[PDB]
Amino acid sequence: GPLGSMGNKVDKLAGVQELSVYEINERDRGSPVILPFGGENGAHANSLGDLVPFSNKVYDGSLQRRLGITAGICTLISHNAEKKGDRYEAQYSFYFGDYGHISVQGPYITYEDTELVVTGGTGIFAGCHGVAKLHQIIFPVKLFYTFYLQGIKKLPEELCASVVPPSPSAEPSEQAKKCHPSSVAPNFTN
Amino acid sequence: GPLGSMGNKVDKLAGVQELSVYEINERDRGSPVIANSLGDLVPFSNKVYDGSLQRRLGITAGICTLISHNAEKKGDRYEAQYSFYFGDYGHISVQGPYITYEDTELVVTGGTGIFAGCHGVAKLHQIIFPVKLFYTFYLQGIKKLPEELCASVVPPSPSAEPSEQAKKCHPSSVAPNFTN
Amino acid sequence: GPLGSMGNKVDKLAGVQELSVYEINERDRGSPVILPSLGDLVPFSNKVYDGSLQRRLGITAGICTLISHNAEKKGDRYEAQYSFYFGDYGHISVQGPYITYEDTELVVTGGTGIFAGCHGVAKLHQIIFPVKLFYTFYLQGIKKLPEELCASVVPPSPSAEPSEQAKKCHPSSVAPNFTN
Ligand SMILES: CC/C=C\C[C@@H]1O[C@@H]1C/C=C\CCCCCCCC(=O)O
Ligand SMILES: CC/C=C\C[C@@H]1O[C@@H]1C/C=C\CCCCCCCC(=O)O
Numbered sequence: 251g252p253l254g255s256m257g258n259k260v261d262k263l264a265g266v267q268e269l270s271v272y273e274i275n276e277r278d279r280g281s282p283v284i285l286p287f288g289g290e291n292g293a294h295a296n297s298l299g300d301l302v303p304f305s306n307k308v309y310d311g312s313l314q315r316r317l318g319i320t321a322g323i324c325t326l327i328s329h330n331a332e333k334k335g336d337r338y339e340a341q342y343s344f345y346f347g348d349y350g351h352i353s354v355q356g357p358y359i360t361y362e363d364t365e366l367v368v369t370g371g372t373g374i375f376a377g378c379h380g381v382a383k384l385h386q387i388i389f390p391v392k393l394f395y396t397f398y399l400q401g402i403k404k405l406p407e408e409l410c411a412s413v414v415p416p417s418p419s420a421e422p423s424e425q426a427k428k429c430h431p432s433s434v435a436p437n438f439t440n
Numbered sequence: 441g442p443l444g445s446m447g448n449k450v451d452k453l454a455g456v457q458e459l460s461v462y463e464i465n466e467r468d469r470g471s472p473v474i475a476n477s478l479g480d481l482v483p484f485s486n487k488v489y490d491g492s493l494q495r496r497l498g499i500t501a502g503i504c505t506l507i508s509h510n511a512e513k514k515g516d517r518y519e520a521q522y523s524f525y526f527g528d529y530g531h532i533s534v535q536g537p538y539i540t541y542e543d544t545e546l547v548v549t550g551g552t553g554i555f556a557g558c559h560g561v562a563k564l565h566q567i568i569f570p571v572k573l574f575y576t577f578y579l580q581g582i583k584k585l586p587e588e589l590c591a592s593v594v595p596p597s598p599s600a601e602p603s604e605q606a607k608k609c610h611p612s613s614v615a616p617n618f619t620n
Numbered sequence: 621g622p623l624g625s626m627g628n629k630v631d632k633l634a635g636v637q638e639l640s641v642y643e644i645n646e647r648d649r650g651s652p653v654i655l656p657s658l659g660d661l662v663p664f665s666n667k668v669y670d671g672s673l674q675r676r677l678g679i680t681a682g683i684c685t686l687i688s689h690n691a692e693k694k695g696d697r698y699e700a701q702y703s704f705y706f707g708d709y710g711h712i713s714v715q716g717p718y719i720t721y722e723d724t725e726l727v728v729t730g731g732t733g734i735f736a737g738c739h740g741v742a743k744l745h746q747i748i749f750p751v752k753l754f755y756t757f758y759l760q761g762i763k764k765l766p767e768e769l770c771a772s773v774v775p776p777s778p779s780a781e782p783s784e785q786a787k788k789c790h791p792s793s794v795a796p797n798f799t800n
């Protein structure tokens with residue numbers, strides 16, 4: 251009916267869905283790269299301006315499927331002698347093969363959880379907005395994210411499998427690591 | 441009345457409009473600034489014309505970061521952040537994949553002026569790499585676009601060229617205070 | 621009732637709220653760094669105060685890329701991607717033009733915390749080049765902003781200065797866990 255149609259349209263516009271994924275640097279992509287553009291003898295020291303292009307692998311929440319990759323850049327903002335607390339400003343995207351991609355913008359802080367802006371998406375993520383929660387499991391090679399996505403159609407079930415709880419021992423299945431056809435997104439990004 | 445008002449408001453929030461433009465590198469702005477390994481940065485700025493190729497609208501401006509090389513496809517993946525400037529109309533910002541060997545879809549992160557508050561996607565179609573590109577924007581949540589921006593689109597092809605007056609920025613063939 | 625519930629939902633989705641802030645470079649963050657004409661990259665981070673200049677909120681952080689020089693107007697055009705951090709309130713991200721010789725409008729790409737799900741535009745006004753700026757955000761789609769962030773705005777001018785308490789980050793004059 252009229253009020254149902256309207257209600258449903260509004261539900262979608264305001265509706266939020268969660269999506270968890272794992273980001274893993276398997277050290278096989280030459281990433282990350284350090285552009286030490288910021289200011290002992292023949293030794294690098296972090297400073298504002300250092301740029302860090304990067305690209306890592308993306309697996310689903312259940313860790314049984316290779317989905318794609320992250321791709322983008324971080325800029326070093328502040329730092330000191332402590333491991334914890336260095337701040338980067340980042341802009342990058344998550345690629346999910348034929349499903350589409352999600353773009354993000356926001357803080358990356360060494361040894362701290364942060365929240366990033368979801369600037370939008372394509373494919374099944376087209377027109378989304380919201381936030382991504384970034385949790386570091388093993389700094390800096392293993393991360394976990396939960397996206398909170400507003401404004402899109404119900405996510406397909408293969409992206410909503412039971413999530414493995416994030417811990418240092420959490421590992422992709424052997425079949426996913428090897429990119430077996432039964433364990434990848436349609437034309438998974440690589 | 442009451443349900444009319446609410447419906448219309450929802451109609452705007454949900455509505456999507458197409459907008460097509462041409463991006464052309466005319467070899468005059470010293471763009472881009474450059475291809476191998478990974479992590480290379482490429483700032484750039486090209487000219488933007490309307491879908492009908494009769495009006496010079498502004499420019500693109502932003503950066504691409506090289507991500508990987510593909511030997512089989514003989515191409516490179518970049519991650520891009522840049523904006524389309526339309527003179528006094530405002531601008532549209534995008535973020536996402538820029539890949540030398542194929543078309544891609546980018547995120548429309550928002551806009552200003554008549555594009556204020558928009559969101560959606562931009563389809564990037566390569567005609568001749570890297571000098572001639574054709575984009576179709578799918579823009580959600582803004583008011584009806586002005587007619588000047590919705591003229592019959594010339595189908596993308598190698599013969600597609602801006603009119604002489606657009607190329608020379610003739611007052612009859614530019615956006616108000618077109619971006620340069 | 622039903623259509624009241626629906627009405628209030630639409631109201632939020634469509635509603636727009638203003639938020640003004642001051643950005644100030646106090647020369648204590650090693651900002652900015654200039655890295656080479658088109659292509660020059662500039663990382664930066666300055667301090668952010670509230671519209672009333674009585675409260676230190678946080679910082680800005682991001683990068684600008686130099687696009688072009690305008691000999692006539694004696695200025696440069698940059699393309700920027702950066703964020704405003706408001707301590708525990710969350711943050712706002714932006715993308716768009718920064719031009720040394722004139723005011724511009726940027727895209728609000730979104731936000732976190734209380735700003736979660738916002739979209740809109742930010743109006744950038746340069747007071748003192750380049751160490752003091754004034755912004756007004758026009759934020760769509762989020763719940764009512766807290767009063768701390770909505771105090772009476774001091775009209776921007778070169779003499780506009782933050783209070784002694786806010787400058788010294790006194791607990792009475794900071795956002796909760798203000799970003800630093
Ligand atoms: C938000 C980006 C997602 C993961 C982090 C991305 O991989 C980039 C890390 C960026 C900054 C951290 C700086 C430490 C980099 C040291 C790398 C050492 C190594 O090669 O393992
Ligand atoms: C266009 C900005 C995005 C990506 C650039 C990508 O690195 C590729 C560009 C390569 C060459 C630019 C060629 C166009 C310049 C016109 C001068 C003609 C010429 O010398 O070939």
Ligand SMILES: CC/C=C\C[C@@H]1O[C@@H]1C/C=C\CCCCCCCC(=O)O
Nearest residue numbers: 645647651652662664666700718750751
């Ligand atoms: C959107 C820009 C926001 C804040 C401005 C940011 O600091 C960047 C200004 C851009 C260009 C100025 C380039 C020359 C500045 C050198 C002087 C810096 C200083 O006084 O510490």
